[PDB]
Design a protein around this nucleic acid. Structure first.
Ligand SMILES: [Mg+2]
Ligand SMILES: [Mg+2]
Ligand SMILES: [Mg+2]
Ligand SMILES: [Mg+2]
Ligand SMILES: [Mg+2]
Ligand SMILES: [Mg+2]
Ligand SMILES: [Mg+2]
Ligand SMILES: [Mg+2]
Ligand SMILES: [Mg+2]
Ligand SMILES: [Mg+2]
Ligand SMILES: [Mg+2]
Ligand SMILES: [Mg+2]
Ligand SMILES: [Mg+2]
Ligand SMILES: [Mg+2]
Ligand SMILES: [Mg+2]
Ligand SMILES: [Mg+2]
Ligand SMILES: [Mg+2]
Ligand SMILES: [Mg+2]
Ligand SMILES: [Mg+2]
Ligand SMILES: [Mg+2]
Ligand SMILES: [Mg+2]
Ligand SMILES: [Mg+2]
Ligand SMILES: [Mg+2]
Ligand SMILES: [Mg+2]
Ligand SMILES: [Mg+2]
Ligand SMILES: [Mg+2]
Ligand SMILES: [Mg+2]
Ligand SMILES: [Mg+2]
Ligand SMILES: [Mg+2]
Ligand SMILES: [Mg+2]
Ligand SMILES: [Mg+2]
Ligand SMILES: [Mg+2]
Lengths: 103, 51
RNA sequence: GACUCGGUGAAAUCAUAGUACCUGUGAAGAUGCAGGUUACCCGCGACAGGACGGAAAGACCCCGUGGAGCUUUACUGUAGCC
RNA sequence: GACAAUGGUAGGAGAGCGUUCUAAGGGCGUUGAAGCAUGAUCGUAAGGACAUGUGGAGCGCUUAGAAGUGAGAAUGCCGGUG
RNA sequence: GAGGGUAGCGGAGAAAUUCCAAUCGAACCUGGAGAUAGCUGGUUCUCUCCGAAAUAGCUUUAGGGCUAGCCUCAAGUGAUGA
RNA sequence: GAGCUGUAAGUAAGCUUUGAUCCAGAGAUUUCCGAAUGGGGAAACCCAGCAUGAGUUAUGUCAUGUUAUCGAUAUGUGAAUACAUAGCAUAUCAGAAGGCACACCCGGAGAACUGAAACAUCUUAGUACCCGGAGGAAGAGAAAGAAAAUUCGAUUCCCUUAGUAGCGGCGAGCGAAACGGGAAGAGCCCAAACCAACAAGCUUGCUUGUUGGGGUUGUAGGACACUCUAUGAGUUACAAAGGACGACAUUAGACGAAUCAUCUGGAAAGAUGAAUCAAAGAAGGUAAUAAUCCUGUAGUCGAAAAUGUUGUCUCUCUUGAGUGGAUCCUGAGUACGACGGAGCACGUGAAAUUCCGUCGGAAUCUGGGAGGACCAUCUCCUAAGGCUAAAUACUCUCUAGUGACCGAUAGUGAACCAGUACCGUGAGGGAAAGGUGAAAAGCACCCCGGAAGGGGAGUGAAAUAGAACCUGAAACCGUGUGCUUACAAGUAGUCAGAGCCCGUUAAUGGGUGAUGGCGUGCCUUUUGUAGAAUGAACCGGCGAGUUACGAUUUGAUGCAAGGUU
């Protein structure tokens, strides 16, 4: 269950196997967004903001369950399990290395 | 023969296995299966209770 | 108003239909059957003899061990009154 | 190889196909499922297939069960179109 | 013209069976209620075998019913049937 | 534990690790109408009084308390009448009213359609409507019982007794009970004699009225006399009532094991191969069909708070056994009877038991009843006063589930901002209407047109998927076409057969038809129909011997003078 400052690797998409960072997560539609993944081009018309708006190329949302958070000490993707040490709960990557990949 | 704290609680995940106490011997599964494997303690009892 | 042209545009009805007349037969009064006779295909304007034309599961008549309203010295009861 | 019998309403008696679901076994499915359209094919009937298009995801076949099981008429009901 | 009253076994009537929310020999709306109907209409897939009656008796019975008569499968008896 | 500001995109300012928004417990706010309650009233409004206070130099205004009716408790006052009572005036109290799912229950009141092949006694049925009162369950209930042998024992409910005994215009039809097998199992408090005060009459007497205490049953218990026992049991639902000391269950949530690679594909969860967990192969989601991608499951933990079960102790409470019965009490206009009537399965009949109405009306332990009238003998039990858990009946909801249950004309009427549009003055009726894709990527731009629409381009695997949107069948209205038709008599075909055009699931081939024979559609209903008898405008969709309980029959299968729950 990823956070807003992670750096992950996809499994199944139009562009699979590519890495990248996460910039938003949308936790009611549970669809996250990664740079450089699945560009969806828009035909915006001339609005009151964009002076004579036109075509562009921006990556848009994909689901959570095509995205797996990879091991920082190994760079192989991994299920993340949780345990708690002292006051809070931290993410072990279940490859015996807990990550620090929040910020 | 009458109970199993483990055999009733192992073999409950595998597809195709039923673990039944010898007094719960119905007739669908015993012809649904193809292979009776019973303990030797209940085998002497099932003739002493069906005959 | 009907009629012709421009505008808009319903309805009851309707088994399928390229739907003639005579004499006869027939559930005894035929656009459909037999035998004749007469008629090329196609529309508009009218007329009302048929299509047992449409409109209402005939009010007339008769049935139901069908209902209602009314009457009386029909039967059984009852509110009141002596 | 014979030998006989086989029109048919009300109604009585047998053998049958198909539709939906479950149980078990065994399969086909993005190299294209169910439905939809078209075809000169197969069975004695109800019906069964097989290619080709359209279709974009869940179906058959054998055995055996249980039923909301089959459409052309009720001045039927509802929605469409004359 | 404005306010008001009388409500179904009831009310109103210069009496006609008139009026009571386009009506009335007893209003409407629910519930008993899928009332009852000896009466009309309707009842859906296929093929083999056999296949009648429209009469008798009695009925508040004559278009209804019950029994005998006439058909049908299943057992028997088996020479009684023409 | 990182984003949020409803359903709801767009904004524009903002909030947020100093812990938001959401999830659970607890508290403050809670305008106005509503039983409406200060008076009115067309519900959501209007008009006030009484004290306090703001305010203006005051009057107008405002603000929070306050005042309905019965009922109870306290004084005031107190007539026609003089003594008191109705009456009257103040102060406290929160008791009531209304609503409910009215589903289930208990009493009051109570029809007809229908069956008998008509109909009045009967039955539909003490059913539906109406009204009253409570509960999470109500009613019943501690023998004036059943029974007939040897008796056993409060009430309720399930199975059999059994469609039997019986009732009935002896017709239609109603229809028990005990014994037996089980479910779940508690029995108790008042009245009276007698005794101790209190008051009264009216005296050391008696009677009467309260207060305690004593006492509550039939193998006859109690009063009164006799003798012997006590800080051990019983309890806050019956038995008298309140409350601190201490284990679980609810109302949020944690953790939670196991995988890769290639191929076709827009995309793999699919195919082929190589691996792994399993107390986890329930279920759903993810661009197709996933045990190992996500949310989960098996198994484990958590609870500041607030309620519910509750175990323990603490408290209240509390004497229980025997004998003598030589006297005294045991529920009065009651039980019963006469008269009309309802209920008991039982229609007044041979009619007990049971309650109501009117009127007469007993005896008391040698009593008093009841054993289907009544009398005799014998067995059983003690009315006219109260209280009571469990077995059992229900779901408008709440929690977790399941389904040979439906998949939009089905399922609730209502998947869709439903009892809404809409019709009715009213009470009340009461519809239609789901689906783009994986993702909004929702067609920038160019062109004709005022726009609507449209052709290109463009996104997308697909726009022949364009927001009337998946799939798109029939009626029906159309477009050029291969054969054919203007001397013809027609339930529209079928069987012969010429000529011209096309070549098949390749078979005694497909379409068209100049001309000859043959011929009055279908269903219901009938002695009979083309019928001028009925029904259908056409095409879709929906739409009619079913189920439970029994009885008798053949077919099947166990066992055999035995079979069976
Ligand atoms: Mg004109
Ligand atoms: Mg004109
Ligand atoms: Mg004639
Ligand atoms: Mg003629
Ligand atoms: Mg004309
Ligand atoms: Mg005329
Ligand atoms: Mg008629
Ligand atoms: Mg025949
Ligand atoms: Mg038959
Ligand atoms: Mg199907
Ligand atoms: Mg039809
Ligand atoms: Mg008509
Ligand atoms: Mg007259
Ligand atoms: Mg008049
Ligand atoms: Mg009816
Ligand atoms: Mg009825
Ligand atoms: Mg024959
Ligand atoms: Mg928003
Ligand atoms: Mg008020
Ligand atoms: Mg003042
Ligand atoms: Mg018990
Ligand atoms: Mg987890
Ligand atoms: Mg997991
Ligand atoms: Mg009497
Ligand atoms: Mg559909
Ligand atoms: Mg709407
Ligand atoms: Mg493209
Ligand atoms: Mg078409
Ligand atoms: Mg002719
Ligand atoms: Mg006939
Ligand atoms: Mg005609
Ligand atoms: Mg007609």
């Amino acid at each position: 269950h990823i956070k807003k400052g992670d750096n992950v690797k996809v499994i199944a998409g139009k562009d699979k196997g590519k890495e990248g960072k996460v910039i938003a997560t949308l936790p009611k539609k549970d669809r996250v967004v990664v740079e450089g993944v699945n560009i969806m081009k828009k035909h915006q018309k001339p609005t009151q903001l964009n002076p004579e708006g036109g075509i562009l190329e921006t990556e848009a949302a994909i689901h959570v369950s095509n995205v797996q958070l990879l091991d920082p000490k190994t760079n192989e993707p991994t299920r993340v399990g949780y345990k708690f040490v002292d006051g809070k709960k931290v993410r072990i990557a279940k490859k015996s290395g807990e990550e620090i990949k929040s910020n | 023969e009458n109970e199993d704290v483990n055999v009733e609680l192992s073999a409950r995940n595998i597809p195709g296995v039923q673990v039944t106490t010898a007094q719960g011997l119905n007739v669908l599964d015993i012809t649904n299966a193809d292979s009776l494997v019973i303990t030797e303690a209940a085998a002497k009892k099932v003739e002493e209770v069906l005959g």
